[PDB]
Amino acid sequence: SNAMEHKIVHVGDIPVANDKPFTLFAGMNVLESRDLAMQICEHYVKVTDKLGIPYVFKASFDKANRSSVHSYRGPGLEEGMKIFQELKETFGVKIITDVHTEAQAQPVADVVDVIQLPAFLARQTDLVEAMAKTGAVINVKKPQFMSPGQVGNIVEKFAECGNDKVILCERGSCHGYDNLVVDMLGFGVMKQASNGSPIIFDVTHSLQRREQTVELAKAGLATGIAGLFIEAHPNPDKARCDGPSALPLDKLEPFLAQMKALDDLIKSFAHIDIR
Amino acid sequence: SNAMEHKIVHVGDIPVANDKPFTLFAGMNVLESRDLAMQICEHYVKVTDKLGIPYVFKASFDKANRSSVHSYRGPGLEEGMKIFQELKETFGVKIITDVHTEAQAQPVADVVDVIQLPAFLARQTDLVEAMAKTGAVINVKKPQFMSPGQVGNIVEKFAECGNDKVILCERGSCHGYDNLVVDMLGFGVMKQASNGSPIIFDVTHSLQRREQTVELAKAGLATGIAGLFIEAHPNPDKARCDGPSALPLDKLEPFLAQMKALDDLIKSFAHIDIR
Amino acid sequence: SNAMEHKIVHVGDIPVANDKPFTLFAGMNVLESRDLAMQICEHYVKVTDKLGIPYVFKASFDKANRSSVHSYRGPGLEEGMKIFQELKETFGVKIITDVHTEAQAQPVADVVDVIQLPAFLARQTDLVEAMAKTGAVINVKKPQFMSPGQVGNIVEKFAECGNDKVILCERGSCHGYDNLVVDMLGFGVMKQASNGSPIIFDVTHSLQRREQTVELAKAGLATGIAGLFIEAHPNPDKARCDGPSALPLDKLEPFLAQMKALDDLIKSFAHIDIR
Amino acid sequence: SNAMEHKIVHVGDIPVANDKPFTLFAGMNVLESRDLAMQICEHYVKVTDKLGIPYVFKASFDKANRSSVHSYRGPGLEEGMKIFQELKETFGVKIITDVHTEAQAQPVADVVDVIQLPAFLARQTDLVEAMAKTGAVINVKKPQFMSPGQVGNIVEKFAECGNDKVILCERGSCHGYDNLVVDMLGFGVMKQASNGSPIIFDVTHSLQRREQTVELAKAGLATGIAGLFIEAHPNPDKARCDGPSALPLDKLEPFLAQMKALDDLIKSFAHIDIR
């Protein structure tokens, strides 16, 4: 079949697309403290600036879906925005974060470059609407429970609300109970179903372990995708959420150098028409 | 092992529990019109009153998670509450409906007897809190993506927010892409993990087909459960949502007569201690 | 839809069919010793004779698919047949056992009443042929990896080889890694795909745990099926294979009394035509 | 963690190992005719000789597990061996084929270089024994129903029978009904569980579609594996079995040139120690 045309979604200067050099959407799970966010952001900026990899800093200001109510959730919106603000002014970074309610969408859109629709919330029509209305670039987490052929409906819902700036993010599919598998065929399926919307791959959450980050990242990149989504921490074990999948921050460079070399080759391969 | 003690959650006079006669939580998918809600409610009341089956009328006032924005969603809260009000005054029915945002919880709790936490929203902590705070009986839809051993965390989150009136509802588990299976072992697992919270079974959504309602209902009832959750319509094919799984309303009586006979036997069986 | 007609497969005097009283195909996993086989058979005969339940004694003479070569496999064919022979002469029992190679089919058919096609072998055409050629009643284990709609091909393969005496046996379906789920909808599907061939349910292997035998047996029986397949042992923990799922032999009576009461009700229910 | 040492299994001069250049085990599904086998073999030899890729020709002499008895199965053993013989003398190729019964193992081992254990048969202990006893290199198809951590038991069973020449072959895992997914994490798991036995990837059967051969092959290769297993045909649609997944033979070169470039990079990457 013919190679299809891929859509470009700009995050400022960064052209995000399936057939462009991969963009790194990465950071930490939650904004644990200002100092930690500054340390992590600085390392990512330094490393990506060195390797020549497009970069958008990720962190959550709230964890809205933990298993206990008293359990640590982040700094919340007000204080999280302050930290994003300082990261932007200090480092000149683009920022992505997730939003959890309709009323959060515009105030967070006022600060960050990409707003993220959580997997469990990805079919909530009023949230999609509120997020669409900000005109912000969107990242939609593909639900663990959704087939890859169904991502067109998500893109279309945003388009109906006037927003054509959608990036889709792979984060694994249910494989029996309490395990996820990443279907590498799903990348192609989503590229088709979305008429070439950029697809990125959340390797970290797909591992819900961290030792396997490298191998799984290479497999997804090998399918020709618009980016990788990664969370890291100086000591993953002490991360306040999802520590068991977080990449050790000190390994970011050797990991990314390999990703870049791999992506650069992959992006150079001609399409083979197989019928 | 020993038979454990099962918790009773009262919906007014109705004692809902795994070892009591099953309670029917049933109605229609969405409040399509006042006349349709009146016709459907009346038939269910007449049939359940005749058979001697405890009954709580179900309908949604909004469909918050459809695949298109312009697509029909229901009458919304204001007008839906008016219809519930008329159903209550006319028929003396208990009512269950789902809530989709924190701000909906109290105003709907002011009208209905049981508020329902949708499957996709079941881990949203702020929603659980808002729902817990109303003091209303809760029905939690078990996510397709959640293992049955994990339902304890849901019950516990409500308890921490001061609400011990939780009923759990089985609605199938992911089985590959775009199919669901109901694990009949999950009933026992949830009864254990929840310290005997009432478990009901949404047969209709488990079938996401309707021909198989009977066979699947009997299998779930055979495991000893607190109730069944069913949606019906005079002509399922013209139902404005999820028509393909809805029971034809005219078949309600022969279906329920069988359920009652089956439940009555099941509830009579002694526990067998197998180690 | 209309209730379809169900095929009867006779194991001597026993009419095995989906709409007849359920037949018990049960015994022990492997022929551990003559004394154990005699003790187990006697208890099953006594209990089933008392309750009025049709009965076929099960045991394997070889375990052909263990994980180690030096690991205990049974008495083998010659000596296993001797034990079946003594069971038949002593107790007047019908016997079912599994066959693993083409050359085993006729010599075992010469002794037993039902020959069983193992799940992993169920698509091996030359084995189906050799088994078909004996003219024996067949029990086919449905592979964990096979959809229920595909059982027609199995029945048809036997029919082409001249054998119309096939019983199909449910034993769970893959649910992610290292777990099985039993799809209760699959019973109806197989009844349709097989034009009403008798379907029995191996509760014991579906549990690959034993505590849950009761609950799962009741769920499967509730769908209207031709029999149950059960393995038991005086002390399951010391069973030489699959001990962790074996029913404790002393619990056979209370278990079967419940099964009979349940089946008798189920078999009394009229078909409900839902379209 | 440390990079482990990988075992080399020689197929003549060809060192097959996870950290060596990938070896191509490829050909056609079934030996449809001598001329077709000659045409297909010649093209593969020419292309692999040109690209510098190690090569072992694959074809089945029998399809033992089709869905109908009268349905085409291949030339059978006698005549299949004759064709392998001519391929070897003409082209100097190494040959792999599958064996289906104990009695086939030695006579096929007498002709071919690698004997293959089919997925459905992979736990049959007597077959493993008979295959082990030939001293031939073995390729074991990993069952769709087996977790990757369980491959150690297979390698160990061969070792107990005196055969340490085992190669493991990924061919997908059950993903609900009638679909397979390839878990890219399973490669690492098998490398560990098998103490570094060579793992190859059957891309063709994993697709049980053919359009996606390229994308899936690249994903598996990206994890660092010992080879690829591929079936092709001049006109896949007219292939006498599994046509819908077969690579079009004319596309072999552009496909393999990409595989080689990708593998060569992957094999050059240092291990990253992530804890």
Swiss-Prot record, chains A, B, C, D:
InterPro entries: Aldolase_TIM (IPR013785), DAHP1/KDSA (IPR006218), KDO8P_synthase (IPR006269)
Keywords annotated in UniProt: Cytoplasm, Lipopolysaccharide biosynthesis, Transferase
Known pathway: Carbohydrate biosynthesis; 3-deoxy-D-manno-octulosonate biosynthesis; 3-deoxy-D-manno-octulosonate from D-ribulose 5-phosphate: step 2/3; Bacterial outer membrane biogenesis; lipopolysaccharide biosynthesis
Gene3D superfamilies documented for this protein: Aldolase class I (3.20.20.70)
Top-tier EC class: transferase
Catalytic reaction(s) noted: D-arabinose 5-phosphate + phosphoenolpyruvate + H2O = 3-deoxy-alpha-D-manno-2-octulosonate-8-phosphate + phosphate
This protein's GO CC annotations: cytosol
EC number: 2.5.1.55
Entry's Gene Ontology BP terms: keto-3-deoxy-D-manno-octulosonic acid biosynthetic process
Subcellular location(s) per record: Cytoplasm
Pfam families: DAHP_synth_1
Molecular-function GO terms, alphabetical: 3-deoxy-8-phosphooctulonate synthase activity
Family (UniProt): Belongs to the KdsA family.
UniProt cross-references to PANTHER family, sorted A to Z: PHOSPHO-2-DEHYDRO-3-DEOXYHEPTONATE ALDOLASE
HAMAP family, per database record: KDO8P_synth
Protein name: 2-dehydro-3-deoxyphosphooctonate aldolase
Organism of derivation: Vibrio cholerae serotype O1 (strain ATCC 39315 / El Tor Inaba N16961)
Gene encoding the protein: kdsA
